[PDB]
């Protein structure tokens, strides 16, 4: 296992192209002059997330590699969008796989999934994250934010836009440095010395509800609770977990590079022991995945699949383990919205823990037999790739038999032509079953996207500023991180976003109004036009150039080098400007 350093950044509400062109490319162009670097790869997702992986030669000091990666990243940091900097860019040196999963449930059923996830994020995640040997912690859920769910009808009723809401929240949820009475230098003889306390961070939905948006000329008040629903809610709503079918959250913990797995596991349990006596009523830690005795199941739906459709497939996966394998399976920890390949509405994972070794006698009751039967039964599931695999056993197979191919755009051809070149290579590879079997892309397919064009002339003619248009569109349909507040003594985020029912259909675009310079409210349809088009939900890049990862295995008998040789021959006949390289195993 070569050591890898990972850069992760978040851009809420951003599409894959926006992420790649305002974050990923800026960082990648600075990732040079780094010692012992073998290759670099990155994903830019329409979840607004980017992950850049830098893989180093075996024997590299992970400490040095993280330091050299971060120092180059500092060159890009001031060029990144403020929305990205505010989320906190992370640089980590961890294994790619989970060492353990700490599950959390409420046996009294007095806490929802949202409640449990917030308790874990606010009372558990940080101390685990600071434990030595812990390289990465993935929360299976989301910490609470103060959610302001805007209503475009009420906002238009009072000549207000999300810009006014965002401005009032910054002004009335503020932590003011106000000085002192009798501070130095004083008038000599001063006796009184006391800090001046002015505004402080709001702490509750009640306080946010009474933020004052405007005073009508007749004296009436427009409060924030008059144009929005206000509640605690997740920073995002993408990741939801279940433990044996009951609501749950948890921490996925990855091992830091070179750290001792047993010592780190013991420190984590020791840290958990400090927190248990202060759990609220009914909360309980469970251990659904300890690294055979365990395995995972990946769930991949086509891009564009909703969270509701992914939940149906996870339900079928969980049902199988809870009924067909109930004599072997001890527990299932299923996560919707987080997958082997990262995060997205169309992915999921299940961690399966088996009963005791002596409690499962027989050939048919071992991990390989169980995962084989599971994957065969899940072969039945259509419109979803589902595979059950024990992690060390598929690494072995792949390493011995598979290859990792990168199709690279080396001439500015663009995403669509790179797709065409990929499909040409895939269809031609299907004409050689004697040497190549199951040649497949590792990424996602293009999906319909809603392209809206802001007419600059109409906006200028009406007196509507572009900043107000983009802020209104982005805050309502994507959400906007406004500032921080204090939830039960802990700093947390405040988000504004449209209530769900006003950001579901394309005609909802016309329900949103922007105030012009002369005070008139202008609907979005007055200065915009829209059309459907296709675009990528996950743009890949390899060594700084657009790329598409293609995986496959040698045919039965033929060696790895013979399968790689044919791929190079096939690649030589692709359109001009399309190159290739070998990564992962094949490197």
């Amino acid at each position: 296992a070569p050591p890898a350093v990972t850069i992760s950044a978040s851009y809420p509400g951003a599409d894959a192209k926006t992420v790649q062109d305002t974050v990923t490319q800026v960082i990648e162009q600075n990732m040079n002059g780094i010692d012992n670097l073998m290759y670099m790869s990155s994903n830019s997702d329409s979840t607004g997330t980017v992950q850049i992986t830098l893989t180093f030669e075996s024997g590299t000091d992970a400490d040095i590699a993280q330091v050299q990666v971060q120092n180059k990243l500092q060159l890009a940091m001031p060029l990144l969008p403020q929305e990205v900097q505010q989320q906190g860019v992370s640089v980590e040196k961890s294994s790619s796989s989970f060492l353990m999963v700490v599950g959390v449930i409420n046996t009294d059923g007095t806490m929802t999934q949202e409640d449990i996830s917030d308790y874990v994020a606010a009372n558990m995640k940080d101390a685990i994250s600071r434990t030595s040997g812990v390289g990465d912690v993935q929360l299976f859920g989301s910490q609470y934010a103060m959610r302001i769910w805007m209503n475009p009808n009420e906002l238009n009723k009072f000549q207000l836009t999300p810009v006014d809401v965002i401005t009032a929240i910054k002004a009335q949820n503020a932590q003011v440095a106000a000085g002192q009475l009798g501070g130095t230098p004083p008038v000599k003889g001063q006796q009184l010395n006391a800090s001046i306390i002015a505004q402080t961070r709001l702490t509750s939905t009640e306080e946010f509800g009474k933020i004052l948006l405007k005073v009508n000329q007749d004296g009436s008040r427009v409060l924030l609770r008059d144009v929005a629903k206000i509640e605690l809610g997740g920073e995002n709503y993408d990741i939801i977990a279940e433990f044996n079918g009951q609501p749950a959250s948890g921490l996925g913990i990855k091992l830091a590079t070179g750290a001792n797995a047993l010592d780190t596991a013991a420190a984590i349990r020791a840290e958990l022991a400090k927190m248990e006596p202060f759990f609220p009523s009914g909360l309980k830690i469970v251990y659904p995945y300890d690294t055979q005795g365990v395995f995972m199941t990946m769930v991949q739906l086509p891009a564009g699949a909703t969270q509701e459709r992914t939940q149906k497939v996870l339900n079928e996966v969980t049902h199988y383990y809870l009924t067909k394998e109930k004599n072997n399976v001890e527990s299932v920890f299923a996560v919707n919205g987080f997958g082997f390949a990262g995060r997205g509405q169309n992915t999921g994972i299940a961690f399966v823990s088996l009963k005791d070794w002596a409690d499962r006698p027989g050939e048919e009751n071992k991990v390989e037999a169980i995962t084989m039967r599971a994957t065969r039964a899940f072969s039945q599931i259509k419109d979803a790739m589902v595979f059950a695999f024990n992690l060390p056993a598929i690494v072995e197979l792949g390493t011995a038999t598979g290859f990792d191919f990168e199709l690279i755009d080396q001439a500015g051809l663009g995403h669509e032509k790179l797709t065409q070149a990929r499909n040409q290579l895939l269809a031609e590879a299907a004409k050689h079953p004697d040497m190549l079997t199951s040649v497949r892309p590792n990424g996602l397919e293009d999906t319909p996207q809603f392209k809206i064009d802001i007419d600059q002339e109409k906006a200028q003619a009406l007196g509507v500023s572009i900043n107000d248009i983009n802020t209104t569109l982005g805050a309502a349909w994507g959400g906007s991180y406004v500032n921080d507040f204090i939830d039960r003594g802990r700093v947390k985020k405040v988000y504004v976003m449209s209530e769900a029912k006003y950001r579901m259909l394309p005609d909802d675009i016309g329900d949103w109004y922007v105030r012009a310079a002369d005070g008139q409210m202008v609907p979005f349809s007055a200065f915009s036009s829209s059309r459907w088009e296709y675009g990528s939900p996950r743009l890949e890049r390899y060594n700084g150039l657009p790329s598409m990862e293609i995986l496959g295995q040698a045919a039965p008998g033929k060696s790895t080098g013979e399968a790689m040789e044919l791929m190079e021959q096939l690649a030589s006949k692709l359109p001009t400007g399309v190159g290739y390289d070998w990564t992962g195993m094949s490197y």
Binding site: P506, R531, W532
Partner: protein
């Protein structure tokens, strides 16, 4: 009819004709209202455009925002496909929800060859969109001298 939507998109002629030989709906639509004719005109698969129209595909099918397969072909420079659609009865003056005609999309991308074919089939050169712009205003705003004189 979902398998035919997938077939008309990935450009696999053989599969497609199996589907209407099996009776798949030639006018099936995905969630954004794109028929297989839309998908074929977008990615520029001429043979499937001809086959689908042969099996009674709606040549004037609209998506959820009022765009027709002629809009997509005129926009993305598919001269072979704009001809095949116009001979089968594509409304050359079809307006989407924004008042955008295929002449607008063709003029914006500088597809002068498609602009001629559109004009030849009776495209209203004076057609405006919701913003009152015609194909000539597009040529002036883009600086396309040649396209500008083809609209007089």
């Amino acid at each position: 009819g979902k398998k035919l939507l997938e077939a008309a998109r990935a450009g696999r002629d053989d599969e497609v004709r199996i589907l209407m030989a099996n009776g798949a709906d030639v006018n099936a639509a995905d969630v954004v209202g794109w028929t297989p004719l839309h998908l074929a005109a977008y990615w520029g698969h001429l043979e499937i455009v001809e086959v689908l129209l042969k099996n009674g595909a709606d040549v004037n099918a609209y998506d959820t925002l009022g765009s027709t397969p002629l809009h997509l072909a005129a926009h993305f420079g598919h001269l072979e496909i704009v001809e095949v659609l116009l001979k089968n009865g594509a409304d050359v003056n079809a307006k989407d929800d924004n008042g955008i005609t295929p002449l607008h999309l063709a003029a914006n991308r500088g597809h002068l060859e498609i602009v001629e074919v559109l004009l030849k089939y009776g495209a209203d050169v004076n057609a405006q969109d919701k913003f009152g712009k015609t194909a000539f205003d597009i040529s002036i705003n883009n600086g396309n001298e040649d396209l500008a004189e083809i609209l007089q």
